[PDB]
Write an enzyme that holds these catalytic residues in place. Structure first.
Site, PDB file in Angstrom:
ATOM      1  N   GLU B 355       6.219  71.837 -20.478  1.00 22.15           N
ATOM      2  CA  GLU B 355       7.381  72.220 -19.669  1.00 22.15           C
ATOM      3  C   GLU B 355       7.088  73.485 -18.874  1.00 22.15           C
ATOM      4  O   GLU B 355       7.966  74.352 -18.690  1.00 22.15           O
ATOM      5  CB  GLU B 355       8.638  72.355 -20.531  1.00 22.15           C
ATOM      6  CG  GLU B 355       8.836  71.152 -21.446  1.00 22.15           C
ATOM      7  CD  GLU B 355      10.269  70.672 -21.551  1.00 22.15           C
ATOM      8  OE1 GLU B 355      11.173  71.354 -21.031  1.00 22.15           O
ATOM      9  OE2 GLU B 355      10.468  69.593 -22.159  1.00 22.15           O
TER      10      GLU B 355
HETATM   11  C1  LIG Z   1       3.257  68.003 -26.412  1.00 18.63           C
HETATM   12  C2  LIG Z   1       3.279  67.688 -24.939  1.00 18.63           C
HETATM   13  C3  LIG Z   1       4.349  66.979 -24.455  1.00 18.63           C
HETATM   14  C4  LIG Z   1       4.430  66.680 -23.113  1.00 18.63           C
HETATM   15  N1  LIG Z   1       5.519  66.004 -22.653  1.00 18.63           N
HETATM   16  C5  LIG Z   1       5.603  65.684 -21.361  1.00 18.63           C
HETATM   17  C6  LIG Z   1       6.745  64.932 -20.816  1.00 18.63           C
HETATM   18  O1  LIG Z   1       7.671  64.560 -21.567  1.00 18.63           O
HETATM   19  N2  LIG Z   1       6.732  64.630 -19.495  1.00 18.63           N
HETATM   20  C7  LIG Z   1       5.726  65.040 -18.696  1.00 18.63           C
HETATM   21  O2  LIG Z   1       5.740  64.802 -17.481  1.00 18.63           O
HETATM   22  N3  LIG Z   1       4.658  65.723 -19.137  1.00 18.63           N
HETATM   23  C8  LIG Z   1       4.545  66.101 -20.411  1.00 18.63           C
HETATM   24  N4  LIG Z   1       3.421  66.824 -20.840  1.00 18.63           N
HETATM   25  C9  LIG Z   1       2.407  67.323 -19.873  1.00 18.63           C
HETATM   26  C10 LIG Z   1       2.605  68.894 -19.636  1.00 18.63           C
HETATM   27  O3  LIG Z   1       3.812  69.354 -18.985  1.00 18.63           O
HETATM   28  C11 LIG Z   1       1.437  69.452 -18.838  1.00 18.63           C
HETATM   29  O4  LIG Z   1       0.368  69.526 -19.800  1.00 18.63           O
HETATM   30  C12 LIG Z   1       1.607  70.784 -18.036  1.00 18.63           C
HETATM   31  O5  LIG Z   1       2.425  70.715 -16.864  1.00 18.63           O
HETATM   32  C13 LIG Z   1       0.269  71.234 -17.433  1.00 18.63           C
HETATM   33  O6  LIG Z   1      -0.528  70.112 -17.025  1.00 18.63           O
HETATM   34  P1  LIG Z   1      -2.115  70.093 -17.341  1.00 18.63           P
HETATM   35  O7  LIG Z   1      -2.208  69.742 -18.811  1.00 18.63           O
HETATM   36  O8  LIG Z   1      -2.888  69.297 -16.345  1.00 18.63           O
HETATM   37  O9  LIG Z   1      -2.605  71.572 -17.086  1.00 18.63           O
HETATM   38  P2  LIG Z   1      -3.203  71.862 -15.621  1.00 18.63           P
HETATM   39  O10 LIG Z   1      -2.078  71.790 -14.653  1.00 18.63           O
HETATM   40  O11 LIG Z   1      -4.507  71.107 -15.519  1.00 18.63           O
HETATM   41  O12 LIG Z   1      -3.685  73.423 -15.749  1.00 18.63           O
HETATM   42  C14 LIG Z   1      -4.696  73.828 -16.691  1.00 18.63           C
HETATM   43  C15 LIG Z   1      -4.687  75.344 -16.836  1.00 18.63           C
HETATM   44  O13 LIG Z   1      -4.754  75.977 -15.566  1.00 18.63           O
HETATM   45  C16 LIG Z   1      -3.592  76.786 -15.320  1.00 18.63           C
HETATM   46  N5  LIG Z   1      -3.251  76.727 -13.877  1.00 18.63           N
HETATM   47  C17 LIG Z   1      -3.363  75.666 -13.039  1.00 18.63           C
HETATM   48  N6  LIG Z   1      -3.019  76.006 -11.777  1.00 18.63           N
HETATM   49  C18 LIG Z   1      -2.713  77.312 -11.805  1.00 18.63           C
HETATM   50  C19 LIG Z   1      -2.286  78.326 -10.837  1.00 18.63           C
HETATM   51  N7  LIG Z   1      -2.097  78.013  -9.541  1.00 18.63           N
HETATM   52  N8  LIG Z   1      -2.073  79.575 -11.306  1.00 18.63           N
HETATM   53  C20 LIG Z   1      -2.216  79.916 -12.599  1.00 18.63           C
HETATM   54  N9  LIG Z   1      -2.604  79.045 -13.520  1.00 18.63           N
HETATM   55  C21 LIG Z   1      -2.861  77.773 -13.188  1.00 18.63           C
HETATM   56  C22 LIG Z   1      -2.556  76.304 -16.271  1.00 18.63           C
HETATM   57  O14 LIG Z   1      -1.678  77.401 -16.546  1.00 18.63           O
HETATM   58  C23 LIG Z   1      -3.447  75.951 -17.428  1.00 18.63           C
HETATM   59  O15 LIG Z   1      -3.874  77.165 -18.063  1.00 18.63           O
HETATM   60  C24 LIG Z   1       3.348  67.139 -22.202  1.00 18.63           C
HETATM   61  C25 LIG Z   1       2.252  67.812 -22.699  1.00 18.63           C
HETATM   62  C26 LIG Z   1       2.184  68.114 -24.034  1.00 18.63           C
HETATM   63  C27 LIG Z   1       0.975  68.884 -24.503  1.00 18.63           C
END
Ligand SMILES: Cc1cc2nc3c(=O)[nH]c(=O)nc-3n(C[C@H](O)[C@H](O)[C@H](O)COP(=O)(O)OP(=O)(O)OC[C@H]3O[C@@H](n4cnc5c(N)ncnc54)[C@H](O)[C@@H]3O)c2cc1C
Ligand SMILES: Cc1cc2nc3c(=O)[nH]c(=O)nc-3n(C[C@H](O)[C@H](O)[C@H](O)COP(=O)(O)OP(=O)(O)OC[C@H]3O[C@@H](n4cnc5c(N)ncnc54)[C@H](O)[C@@H]3O)c2cc1C
Ligand SMILES: Cc1cc2nc3c(=O)[nH]c(=O)nc-3n(C[C@H](O)[C@H](O)[C@H](O)COP(=O)(O)OP(=O)(O)OC[C@H]3O[C@@H](n4cnc5c(N)ncnc54)[C@H](O)[C@@H]3O)c2cc1C
Ligand SMILES: Cc1cc2nc3c(=O)[nH]c(=O)nc-3n(C[C@H](O)[C@H](O)[C@H](O)COP(=O)(O)OP(=O)(O)OC[C@H]3O[C@@H](n4cnc5c(N)ncnc54)[C@H](O)[C@@H]3O)c2cc1C
Lengths: 367, 372, 374, 364
Positions: B355
């Site tokens: 989130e």
């Molecule tokens: C238990 C769990 C439940 C979930 N439930 C849902 C759900 O119900 N619905 C849903 O849609 N998704 C869900 N997700 C997905 C979740 O919201 C995402 O993992 C989150 O938005 C980040 O996506 P990502 O994993 O690709 O991280 P990424 O977006 O790949 O980023 C990876 C890292 O880089 C950082 N980062 C990236 N861009 C920037 C920037 N411009 N500035 C600073 N930092 C940056 C992030 O902070 C992080 O440290 C869930 C995930 C988990 C783990």
């Protein structure tokens, strides 16, 4: 000698330890086939002299090995670390010529595996207040229980600590070479842990356990000193484990970093992210030197304070990796970073909790 | 009163029902279908009005529920949190009178379970750059692409799903959809194996020319990005509340153990090394508590609450992860699955990530500061 | 600083420090006046050109010994530590390393002896972190370079005889069109601003410099035109290890004072040290100081023996931040620590600078991260 | 009906110029105090009966918060005056209330709190100043240290050992007037910060104190700590104001200051600090005001939490850093915030003590 050891252990690690490690994370089964192999490749008695059947190396080379192995697997790192530093070395350093010759070659080769039986349900930080008794009548008779014993059930030799003189406390503790096939000596079920999957951490039950008087790791009352003395070299190893953990976190985090694109740029282009990486790298350079200087001191020198510093620093630094950089993926068992957190946390706890280490350090200062 | 009553009611329930279920979840890793049902009967499934078949209570009460449930089980806390805040509320707040009536009562009762589909392999933090397309063909919208990391995945009956209606507009061309589980061409992936939140089904979703009725379009075309973030606010306060509950469990357990556990002739608590951790834990939990509830009180008053919700999420989450200490205070025993603290760490870490990762939250917060 | 030798330097500087630098330091904290007499003395005792060769009139020693000196001096006085550090590493070394044989001979012996004092002139109101975007112009005219613009925050300002000064030759080339100049203090059109009133480093003179059609001899051009940016950063590396060593000394002073006080000071019937709340801080202080020590000396050992830029950044950031974390020392003295008559409050005030100059810690993390992402 | 608005305007208009004079001169702001007196800021949580703005503890703490944005020094002077210079009389002291408070309330008189001693600080129980009745007049002997409002103050709420063999239980509390025979004030201390909040030593040499006994003999320790609670929320409010000033300055500077072609704020290295600052200031804000709302409506644990949190959070405006070199400069407005910040971790109960206290509620 050292540059060669490092390259040898790096190649072995990547080739043999890497596949085994994934099986360990999946199975949670002690890597019997791996240990054996590491034995053949002369990794199991590195700071042991050749006289007694080891590699004839130091100390820095040995700690170096543990560092490298822990990059790939913290579990295997601690197994190796315990085996040598507290499973083998107590014999090497405090044992007699006869015992050295009987017990060490098989430990060194890896035909035999080593364990360290100090901790108890009621004694675990206050190790002085252990309750296991050893009453002699040319057979010592051991009674009581150990807990949280690394290399439990895999191990052939257990360096075991037990009260010979109960009315003295920390001063009435003796140390024993206990063999696994000892009559009233039993091993408990594999403990289910947060991490170090693969390791094998068990309870030990001592029920009128019959230990030969000749297996007294001499002399009577010296046991507490023997324990702590080795725990020093052991702690540098734990620090080296923490170091390897932390490096693995860093290297993975950089590469992911880097490749992973969001907002039209790789995530690394964000200072929020890059600054973490730098901090990780900086605290890993800090940790590195604490570890190796501590091991260089030990390689005739008083090294106790330095080893406490290393253990505490590397361990805390390592926990600081944290998963975040991988994002959602980092919370996943299929990806390689979640294990590092789980594994990390241990490093703050065993071979002397960081509360204890600060205490110890502070005792040198207030001196 | 309503609130003090809710809190006691949820405390008692949690303890008698959620506690046994939670141990089964940690052992099995299986979604707690029965518990959910029961929670449904007991009217927990809260900030929905009675008109549409809910409890008719307010957002503080609701968040207060999530807080208390998360003391016992973070998993069950997020399942509830998602279901309401982002599985049900988007309909409630942006949907039309017909849709509210069709979909919400079953969601409210707990006969139906809710999900939120936003995230994608290529779009997470940058949720704007999602690739799932929704092309209108034959009075039916036609959805194509994939979602990832979807909480409530495979348990859920309704999925609030976000998809490109106008691909050339990026973040401005995203629409929001009420997707039903029995939709043709809509398929659920295998349960994902995670560090923690053991019972909480997290799955992939495959959209293959998935046929979604035009009438299931949630609000106007292009509104979807706004809808998402708007609810993610109330969702984030819930995550914060989850982090809070986690942290309080760490503390309580830590205090009790530290009082009873003796070493060196005294209880471990008698050591300032230890006691000072406890105090820090307690202080940061008092800090967190107020961030959470003031954020929810703002939202309850119909007011701008976005910045406050970001602050809460980031604070509570980070504070909660700092119950590495609890593990430490028990430990070796704290490293053990038979003891109750190791789960808190594993569970904690997620709170910093989903989130809206804490990197994103700081970014958001900073955007309020800079103005302008 | 282990593993020679360099054990003689350390004892020599420790004794000098405690005897001569200690009284001077208390005068500096009270007066805020640059310690002209101490400097002179340090000059006689061969401290002012330590990693300078004997050829050019210095001590003929190595960079570990030098950094070691700065470490030791900073235990007693961070102010005097930086004055020394700037003088050598960025006031004298740029000549030593990039200057020509004639210049080395003309300018260094007086710098080395301490008859002359050195300064570094890079930073400007509009260019600091982004030192590339400096605006001071140097236009060749008549028989002379003609310098125009202003510097800010210049250590050794008004005490200094030589100012290693950076100026655009070369404006359309940005960071690549910067040149470096040996500027002498009696230069026509070159003026020094009022002593800046700072949080700490009492009295390390920090001043503004005004360049008004300032006439600098062509022969005082330091290396080839356009080399200046490279010259600056190259030295700033050795400079940063020095700043780290400064931060180290600061931190060790905090610790040693804190231990001693904590042992003697009694409340609740026991010394305050008997409390883990307190002792654990001390241990942390000691541990981070051991960490810092090795970062510093390994960085200086690399430079003595190689590419050292990343390691120097790490040291500067680590020691500096660690040092600011005392601040625990103030706390350990309690009320007394908030008092100017007691010796810990200066350590905080002084500490904070170490995070800022010769490249803010934001910059250092950036630099470090650039080596990683390479 | 809670102003703020009144104290914000006053602060910005009157306290701002005075504060720059205080930083330059290190001289107690006699004239400002007087003025604050006329504007009804001295005595805020005092009832009107005793002369008296007649307001509550939130409005009072609120005042201190607002003032501390601009000063800190002035904030602590006000905070001590009321919470530990006036309130002990108000809460433990009908004749004395009438005699002493109106002049304190109006600001015609200034208040002080004389507890700490060279040998007793954190362990305030082990104070050594004696008060021996000879005969029907108390006779005080010993020394105080680190006394805020020292030499400016007219009234000193003083603590002094009526039954030496009882330790913490034999301490009494006294209303000491500044013109007392044998009572002397030491030189102005000269500190890292809180420029010029007069902090002094006090010498008691057979000092003749009358009826000025504050409550029953032996109650003094209880009186001290009781007030130190409301005092600590004030210190927290001080720490809050300090922190907010750090933030607001830091944001504005960071937006305007350009390096590398973009404002420094555009860098996450920088922005993230700002966000953290803002977040911990929101955290602090609620700890403070809920603590004060508890006391208004007991509050000991919450007050400890506030003091420790705000104070530590405030010191974390070392993030000076954002102004860069300029931040290290006395002409710029952030260097003071660090110097001033650090005190907040130390007085009215060091943060080591506060954690201890908090932990005592947990373990009980
Ligand atoms: C238990 C769990 C439940 C979930 N439930 C849902 C759900 O119900 N619905 C849903 O849609 N998704 C869900 N997700 C997905 C979740 O919201 C995402 O993992 C989150 O938005 C980040 O996506 P990502 O994993 O690709 O991280 P990424 O977006 O790949 O980023 C990876 C890292 O880089 C950082 N980062 C990236 N861009 C920037 C920037 N411009 N500035 C600073 N930092 C940056 C992030 O902070 C992080 O440290 C869930 C995930 C988990 C783990
Ligand atoms: C995987 C694993 C393997 C292990 N392997 C072995 C092994 O092979 N051999 C062996 O001997 N032991 C082993 N241990 C045990 C370990 O050494 C002890 O668990 C450790 O010292 C902590 O003791 P405890 O578990 O009794 O908990 P406690 O010591 O009760 O610790 C609880 C808390 O008390 C604190 N504490 C206690 N006393 C003090 C004090 N005076 N000051 C400050 N803090 C204090 C600690 O910080 C800790 O947070 C292992 C543990 C694990 C998890
Ligand atoms: C500017 C200023 C104004 C002041 N104004 C006033 C005033 O108006 N009225 C007044 O009464 N006092 C005043 N004080 C005094 C202040 O209350 C004391 O400094 C404080 O209470 C502690 O006294 P100390 O300095 O001797 O510290 P100490 O008690 O010597 O303590 C020093 C250190 O030891 C630690 N410590 C000691 N015992 C323990 C323990 N058991 N557990 C954990 N840690 C411990 C503390 O945490 C601290 O870090 C003022 C001080 C200052 C600096
Ligand atoms: C005691 C003292 C002595 C000094 N001595 C000298 C000397 O001898 N010679 C000399 O030339 N100069 C000297 N200076 C000036 C000093 O080097 C500068 O203050 C420094 O280079 C930083 O620049 P700045 O002051 O403009 O602040 P800025 O560089 O504008 O930075 C403001 C803040 O923003 C950050 N920042 C700015 N841009 C970025 C970015 N892209 N990424 C991340 N963070 C960023 C910085 O980290 C800093 O925290 C001295 C300063 C002091 C205080």
């Amino acid at each position: 000698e050292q540059v060669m050891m490092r390259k040898m252990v790096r190649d072995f690690a990547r080739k043999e330890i890497a596949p085994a490690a994934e099986i360990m994370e999946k199975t949670d089964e002690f890597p019997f086939q791996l240990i054996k192999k590491m034995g053949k490749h002369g990794l199991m008695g590195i700071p042991v002299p050749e006289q007694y059947g080891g590699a004839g190396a130091d100390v820095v080379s040995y700690i170096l090995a543990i560092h490298e192995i822990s990059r790939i697997s913290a579990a295997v790192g601690v197994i190796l670390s315990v085996h040598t530093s507290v499973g083998t070395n107590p014999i090497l350093y405090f044992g007699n010529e006869e015992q050295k010759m009987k017990y060490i070659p098989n430990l060194a080769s890896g035909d035999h595996l080593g364990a360290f039986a100090l901790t108890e349900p009621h004694s675990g930080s206050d190790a002085g207040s252990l309750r296991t008794t050893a009453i002699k009548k040319g057979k010592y008779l051991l009674n009581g229980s150990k807990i949280f014993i690394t290399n439990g059930g895999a191990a052939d030799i257990y360096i075991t600590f037990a009260l010979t003189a109960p009315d003295q406390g920390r001063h009435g503790i003796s140390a024993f070479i206990v063999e696994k096939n000892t009559p009233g000596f039993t091993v408990g079920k594999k403990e289910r842990k947060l991490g170090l999957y693969g390791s094998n951490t068990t309870e030990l039950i001592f029920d009128n356990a019959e230990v030969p008087e000749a297996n007294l790791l001499g002399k009577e009352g010296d046991g507490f000193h023997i324990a702590m003395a080795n725990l020093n070299v052991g702690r540098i190893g734990i620090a080296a484990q923490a170091l390897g953990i932390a490096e693995a976190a860093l290297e993975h985090a950089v590469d992911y970093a880097k490749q992973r694109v969001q907002f039209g740029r790789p995530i690394a282009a964000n200072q929020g992210i890059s600054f973490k990486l730098a901090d990780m790298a900086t605290r890993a350079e800090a940790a590195r030197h604490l570890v190796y200087h501590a091991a260089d001191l030990h390689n005739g020198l008083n090294c106790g304070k330095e080893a406490s510093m290393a253990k505490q620093f590397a361990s805390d630094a390592a926990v600081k990796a944290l998963v975040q950089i991988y994002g959602g993926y980092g919370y996943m068992k299929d990806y390689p970073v979640e294990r590092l957190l789980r594994d990390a946390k241990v490093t703050q706890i065993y071979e002397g909790t960081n509360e204890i280490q600060r205490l110890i350090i502070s005792k040198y200062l207030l001196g």
